[PDB]
Amino acid sequence: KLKKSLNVAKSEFDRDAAMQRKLEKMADQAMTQMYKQARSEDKRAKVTSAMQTMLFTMLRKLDNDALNNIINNARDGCVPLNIIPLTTAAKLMVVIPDYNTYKNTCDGTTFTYASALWEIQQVVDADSKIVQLSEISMDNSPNLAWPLIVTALRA
Amino acid sequence: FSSLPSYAAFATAQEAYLKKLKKSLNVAKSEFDRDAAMQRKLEKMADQAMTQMYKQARSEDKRAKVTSAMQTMLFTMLRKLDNDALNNIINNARDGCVPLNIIPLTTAAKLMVVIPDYNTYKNTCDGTTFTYASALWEIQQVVDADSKIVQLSEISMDNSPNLAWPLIVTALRA
Amino acid sequence: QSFLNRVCGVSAARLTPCGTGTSTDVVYRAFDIYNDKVAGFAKFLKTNCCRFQEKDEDDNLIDSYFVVKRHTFSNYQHEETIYNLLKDCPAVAKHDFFKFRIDGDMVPHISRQRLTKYTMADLVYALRHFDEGNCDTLKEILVTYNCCDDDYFNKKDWYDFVENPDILRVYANLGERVRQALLKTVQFCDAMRNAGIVGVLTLDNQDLNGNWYDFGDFIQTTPGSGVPVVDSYYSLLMPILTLTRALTAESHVDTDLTKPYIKWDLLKYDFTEERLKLFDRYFKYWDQTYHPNCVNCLDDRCILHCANFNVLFSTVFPPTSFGPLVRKIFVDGVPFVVSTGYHFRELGVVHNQDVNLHSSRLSFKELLVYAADPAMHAASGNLLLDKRTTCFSVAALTNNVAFQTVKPGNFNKDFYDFAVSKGFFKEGSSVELKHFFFAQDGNAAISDYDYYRYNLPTMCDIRQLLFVVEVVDKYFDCYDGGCINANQVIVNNLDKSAGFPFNKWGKARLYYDSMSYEDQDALFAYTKRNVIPTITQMNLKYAISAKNRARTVAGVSICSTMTNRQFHQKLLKSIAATRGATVVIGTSKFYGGWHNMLKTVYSDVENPHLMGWDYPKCDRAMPNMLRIMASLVLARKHTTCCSLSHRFYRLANECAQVLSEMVMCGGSLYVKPGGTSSGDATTAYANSVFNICQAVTANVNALLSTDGNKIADKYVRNLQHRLYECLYRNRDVDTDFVNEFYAYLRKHFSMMILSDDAVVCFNSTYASQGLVASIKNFKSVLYYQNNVFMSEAKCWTETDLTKGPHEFCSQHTMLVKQGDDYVYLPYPDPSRILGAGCFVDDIVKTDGTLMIERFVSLAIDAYPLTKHPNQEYADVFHLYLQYIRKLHDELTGHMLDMYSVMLTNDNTSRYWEPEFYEAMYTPHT
Amino acid sequence: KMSDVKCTSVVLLSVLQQLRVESSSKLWAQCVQLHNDILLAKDTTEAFEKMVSLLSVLLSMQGAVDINK
RNA sequence: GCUAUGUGAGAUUAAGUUAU
RNA sequence: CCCUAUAACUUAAUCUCACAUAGC
Ligand SMILES: *P(=O)(O)OC[C@@H](CO)CCn1cnc2c(=O)nc(N)[nH]c21
Ligand SMILES: [Mg+2]
Ligand SMILES: [Mg+2]
Ligand SMILES: [Mg+2]
């Protein structure tokens, strides 16, 4: 009786082969899901560091002593957001579409906007080339690449 | 298909066909079935890889030669357009006569053309008006590469080697 | 002549009889009427009175009128008694009672003196029922009160808010006169209370100087206890208050137009007592309680009623007070600036509950809501003054201004010369090329953003809006909704953008993998108690079009998108899954879906015509009241899973995230006035709610503006009476009449809705009598509620239902024979299909051997052109077939000549036989 | 006849975009204005008129050599 | 109880097209 | 370097389920 002996042996190899296939597949899905999970937590650490350094540079960019004054003068320490750059921003950028807007808005080295004195520092055009203040004129207006961007400082 | 030895074995087992080699043709039929299925899987993924490498090769060829193919396509259909207004400014840019700014559609507007030799001048200008882009234009002046204003009587047949060859004509439309 | 001097009275004046003889004259005026038999705001003929024109001592006819009232005898004693109890008030007009012999009999006359020609009801009717070519009363009022002289009217489209924005200045010249009328009405109500007089105040008893008369229905009571009904007066007047900008004097010192403006404190944001004082001054006798902050409201109906008053009173206050309310927060001992609140134009002041002054560290959720907050980006950016736009500019993030352009399209030359070799693009052909990629310069993105100047603050008729919202809710009652957890969320695309500032670090897959399900549920529970303002980024769209206008698309950040998915996805999926409803989002046009949609929209209408309208500048000019209404309609599915303050904070998050959010446009933060953001998850559904709302209020305005005597059907007349009752008299929801009016609308005004595009099948006989809405009713409703002029060149009608709708989702309809029956098939414009083929947005699509899959879709979309009578239209489908076969042969040739073994290329001959495309339109899927 | 003009317009503007015309904003604005008008033009008499201007923008640059063509 | 071959259905991913 | 939302359809590749066939 050896035919039924290799019958029992082949049934045993069929059992262990089915378990072999499912456990190798199991190690496959386990190792690729831990690939996914390990790289995903690495992504989470990278995004945490990136958002943290973004907020940490952004706090250092804002000038606090002009800000703490208008916050402490508030009745509860709560102010609108629309007045924070209106009152505590050192720089002002003005985008000016043509010359008729320019001669009204910023004519001269110093203009007044939002109850403050602004000293014009630099003027660039839409190609971002430095435009002199002598170049902005009514007869030289078709040679300029409009709009002009005027960056000023708080006087 | 005919390229198998398993097909020849299954065909031999079937042409032998009672019940004892029926078992043989059944197991050989399962043999030939899994063999033809594996050949179909190989032809499957071979067609997949061949068409994928074809896609990436033709796409990178397009992205590589986009700018030269676009410059070649443009003068193919500009030639097809058959327009003497467009052909005037193409043949003039061929022999060297290129404008400095946009040709204005409006009348009485400034136009800055460059004429580099005397035959280009005489085949364009005759009198105080000159023809360009299928229109008559009014000469206002002509200035030099050495930056001095030349009037129309100064340039002529003999003293054209005497003056500097880039002549910039300021022109207003009729 | 003896009657004319009798009318002059003790006061000295010069008169001219408008009517002839001693008889009366008929005038066509508008009346707010409500009887036992008739109701509505309609134009009736006035027969009771006789009016005398007054003229100055330089002999030209002036606005003063002497109008005598010839009525019954018992009305004379009653009117005279009421007048003698109110005579001291300066709000009442002067009344001279007498009896004058007409035909041998003494007939009592009531002469009302120094009246204008038109009442307030004439103004409200002329502005709420606007029809160009029939606008002589509005022109007469505008000429009379110095808003504009008569040749201003000569200019074409003078009335259009888009083609002529000076009409807002012309209409705002009537604001001071309207404000005076409101003050006089308050004075008259106080006099009625002190004189113990009760009664309804209507618009046709007050002339344009603000003086009151007609004490016909007034009845006396104990002095000091008189209640006057002003619900109908104020609610009918409410759109005129913002169209004419009546409260513009309130921003000046002492409310005088010559004084300078009030300079408020820049730190001030509350304005609660100022709103209460405005309400107490102008709407003193309004019985419903007004909450200045809508966090204290009782349901969504109260939220709508109080937000309608907030949109009027917010036009007085400075625009720097609205928006996020920021506070100093200490993380790690380092001060931050985070937004711990929000001051809404519509919802008042909203304060975040879960704030912490000091935080030892920041959780991924805390970092996520601090990065999405515009407070840190605006508090560190430069100040920006942008003169290119009129919208409010907040801050410049970058030291430079970004100018992005739109490239031109890439030309597919092979398909074009294959098409012209087949006979296309000849002269005089019905098939042109009209859809191209239009290039844009660097100034295109900020000039698209300057179309939000078409959004104006709009006060609504609150009574009809409250009734209209109940009717609109019935349309969406079949669907099921509510909140779902984060594991039940189905995202279509995870490799799209994450918005600003989250696009700096990765896509949406990064934030859906970095965040656990517990983190997403904690973020949703955080938005149920707090308001997170977010930044929406505007990007120009590179797509084929037939118009040279640029198109921008709003990109909402991943925080708002992630929370709004958990709030709205169960309802949105339910709407898409449903078939055979009014809103047809999610219904395929293939496999017979177009025929089933057309059969469903026809339904069972007795005298059916077809009608389709247009919304000019739909997303730009959509008012915030209708957007909040649409959010409340979609939020009404949360009765079990949410409390009322949870639903309020979700509404406030929706407002601060997609209605009035900070918009980044080229490295620069701007304030968005309002409108719909395309990037928002619920934009398509909310536009469907808005469309159904505008159609229902068009039907309500059509049914109330008709003469109730001329309605022959008794059911429609009783329906009009109960309609006026449930709008203006009843204050609670009458669900039986809402069901009856909804059944009337489903029977006579059958609509098919998909986003902002809708087609309506309606009873044309009821429309020719005014019982259902028409094109003119839609134009009037879009005039006074949307602030746009809907021209009739963009609307269509169809009297023959064998032809389908004229256009739906930019598809036409033909009746073709498929098998043994006739079905409706959609077909597109052949220029659109040809344009997609001849031009592409990538150089990779210019060869066809890589893009056979692209021309198969174009062929599938262009199959029903073969059943067209035009041979040229039919030829477009065959051209795509022959080109697909040519691409197959060129693919075979090139892949053979480069690689020596031949591709077998299996199941590809189906692509150039029309049975594969014929199967896409037969009903068996 | 009109369609050849419109397709040559889009080919010319994509060539000009390849030659970095949009680094100068004013010239790129003039080019886009000419390109949009040719596409929306209802007659080929004045569509060739704008084509001369748009082609002269290319011919005024020496990034291409048309002596080869 | 197992193995292999085909035929359909559903789900996931990728690419594309149209509509709003 | 930027490129939205939703819906429908097409193609491709996988993975499960059902059915028919043949061996142990
Ligand atoms: P339709 O194009 O006529 O729709 C009008 C529209 C406003 O732009 C609102 C529809 N809508 C909303 N969001 C959209 C989007 O992202 N894309 C498109 N094509 N339409 C949108
Ligand atoms: Mg009256
Ligand atoms: Mg009366
Ligand atoms: Mg629209």
Ligand SMILES: [Mg+2]
């Ligand atoms: Mg539309």
Ligand SMILES: [Zn+2]
């Ligand atoms: Zn309330």
Ligand SMILES: [Zn+2]
């Ligand atoms: Zn809920």
